[PDB]
Amino acid sequence: GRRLVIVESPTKARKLASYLGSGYIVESSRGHIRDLPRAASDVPAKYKSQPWARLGVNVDADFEPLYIISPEKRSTVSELRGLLKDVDELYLATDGDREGEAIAWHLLETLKPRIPVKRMVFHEITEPAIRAAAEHPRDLDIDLVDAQETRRILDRLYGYEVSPVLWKKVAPKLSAGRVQSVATRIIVARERDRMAFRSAAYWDILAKLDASVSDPDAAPPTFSARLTAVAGRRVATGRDFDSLGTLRKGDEVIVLDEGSATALAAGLDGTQLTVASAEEKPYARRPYPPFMTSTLQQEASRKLRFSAERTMSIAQRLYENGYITYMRTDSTTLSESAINAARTQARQLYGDEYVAPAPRQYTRKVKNAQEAHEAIRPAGETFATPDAVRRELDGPNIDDFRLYELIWQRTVASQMADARGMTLSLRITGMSGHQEVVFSATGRTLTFPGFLKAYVETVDELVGGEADDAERRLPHLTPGQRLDIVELTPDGHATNPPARYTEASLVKALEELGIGRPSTYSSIIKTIQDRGYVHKKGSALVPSWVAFAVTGLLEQHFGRLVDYDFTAAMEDELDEIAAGNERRTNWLNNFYFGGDHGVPDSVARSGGLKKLVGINLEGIDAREVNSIKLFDDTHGRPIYVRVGKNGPYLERLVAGDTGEPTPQRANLSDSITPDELTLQVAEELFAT
């Protein structure tokens, strides 16, 4: 009467056993047990006669893979086979997505069971959910397994073709990563934009206005307003300049400068201003959807200041320990049990009035219904309360509680009433000598906070901006109303360069572009940092010089491999395989060898990966690949950054003791971000 259940982790193994009980033996497999060979020694004697064995994929036989058991896992497999001898049934209880199905498949291929096999799938670890999945198994989904394998093979083939190019042309020991190099490109593209940015200056006037003489009961009696128009011409703002600091070809504006603006203020000093136009418009904010993988990583980054990787390790533990639903999901759907628990929680915590009128469903179409069933929300039909979870996850597990609290608040808020308020608009007029001038003020009231009492999104550190519960108080003003000028400050400004990415904004970008998946966002963000391509300056991601060199090589000579659209399209086709709408072998064959299928002008339609990469590379100069153009000096001489084996250093060709060509060099580190190394900075380190 003995049943064996296999999962990926000891924590999950202990948790399922607690729920299953007697007559079940629950073991862990440490994740994957087989992979393609990673070394010549991974190749078994039987295959040492196959020249493709080390590669591990036989491209001339429909991409047959060589899966071997990694030496680090041979132990695990031995024990599993040992235990299998003594049971009546095998339960495979890995995660329900393509990774988990692939593990199940591999266990079947490795153990070769001669007893019944049931495959359990669940998206939360509770006693009911576990019991249910045991009683109602799901057939192994081969389409999922084929999708995972296609991606595994693709990565192997990609590394095989592309790494040698990086080795000859950039640096040895660099490792190719296809999606990674796209993520890297996004970051490098932003740094270049910052480097080509040129600021424009623009001035206006800020006034403090008092309404208390014309209306003794104005609330508040004072406020601020900005100069918006002078003599029918609209004052220049930051949005009016392009990245080169020149005015955009649109409507007609005045750029004020210091002397311009203070002349206007001095000519105003004395007068009153007059309310020409007050307007109220109500607004209604709908609450945030429940968390999915990308939005959870974003909010944890902006609010808790957790890296993407950190958020996923914590979420993993919460899920394995029964606290939350599955944390790899692109669904924001809540089950009816969860909608009711949130509604109740909200009514108990905040009031009957703060509960949405009718229950709120957030049903967005998921890419694959087999891998994602539900948003990320507290597990169990009744949510474990934040205090109870706070006590269990105290001390060392404090980051786990903090994430749970974030998830709980988000779920609860998602069932709450709309935020209500008014948005205030003001047109104030006046006279600075000859010219008529317009000051403007805007305001927002939050009459009824709604879900915002339970959850408010955090604004991106670098982008800046206003939170969705921020209010600007303005007094009730009426046309004709005179206003007293309390103070006038002529105000100078400059346009700013485009903000760098935080992890939160990178994840957002990967999602909008269709390049990231719930299973991949954090591993993408993590790897580009490990491998040195990118590092953090505070909360900002900054590319390293080697990132420029690699990105440059790929853009110049293999552009399709790092094109945002081609990348997204491939991610989509892999999902197509997962659904059963495209075949593993056809896809690999088209991708590697070329074919007539795929988005126009893609790798597949351009002759395949193999012909694409294997051009004549002797035409590609390593020296230029490792040279990043910065600018010319005040003598017309190109100054570039050279990526050398000893690292990054600045170089320029100068006139020597005889003449040119003489290279003048100066060494460089992390301390100087690319957009910080200006000509001033460069000259300063060429000399000292």
From Swiss-Prot:
Give the enzyme's EC designation.
5.6.2.1
Question: In the UniProt record, does the keyword DNA-binding occur?
Answer: yes
Protein task: Releases the supercoiling and torsional tension of DNA, which is introduced during the DNA replication and transcription, by transiently cleaving and rejoining one strand of the DNA duplex. Introduces a single-strand break via transesterification at a target site in duplex DNA. The scissile phosphodiester is attacked by the catalytic tyrosine of the enzyme, resulting in the formation of a DNA-(5'-phosphotyrosyl)-enzyme intermediate and the expulsion of a 3'-OH DNA strand. The free DNA strand then undergoes passage around the unbroken strand, thus removing DNA supercoils.
All copies of domain Topo IA-type catalytic, residue ranges: 141-600
For the region Interaction with DNA, give the residue spans: 175-180
Domain of life of the source: Bacteria
One record GO biological process: DNA topological change
Domain called Toprim: residue spans:
2-126
Active site (UniProt): 326
For Mg(2+), which residues are the binding ones?
A: 8, 95
Give the residues of the full protein shown. Answer: 17 to 704 of 934
Q: Which reaction does this chain catalyze?
A: ATP-independent breakage of single-stranded DNA, followed by passage and rejoining
Which GO-annotated molecular functions does the record name? DNA binding; DNA topoisomerase type I (single strand cut, ATP-independent) activity; magnesium ion binding; ribonuclease inhibitor activity
What does the further note read?
Answer: Was identified as a high-confidence drug target.
Which cofactors are required for activity? Mg(2+)
Self-association and partners = Monomer. Interacts with mRNA interferase MazF4. Interacts with DNA-binding protein HupB.
TM spans (from-to) = none
Task: Give the family from UniProt.
Answer: Belongs to the type IA topoisomerase family.
Q: What is this protein called?
A: DNA topoisomerase 1
Activity modulation notes: ssDNA cleavage is inhibited by MazF4. Relaxation of supercoiling is stimulated by DNA-binding protein HupB.
Q: Which UniProt keywords apply?
A: DNA-binding, Isomerase, Magnesium, Metal-binding, Topoisomerase
Residues the UniProt record annotates as site (Interaction with DNA):
32, 151-152, 155, 160, 167, 328, 531
GO CC list? cytosol; peptidoglycan-based cell wall; plasma membrane
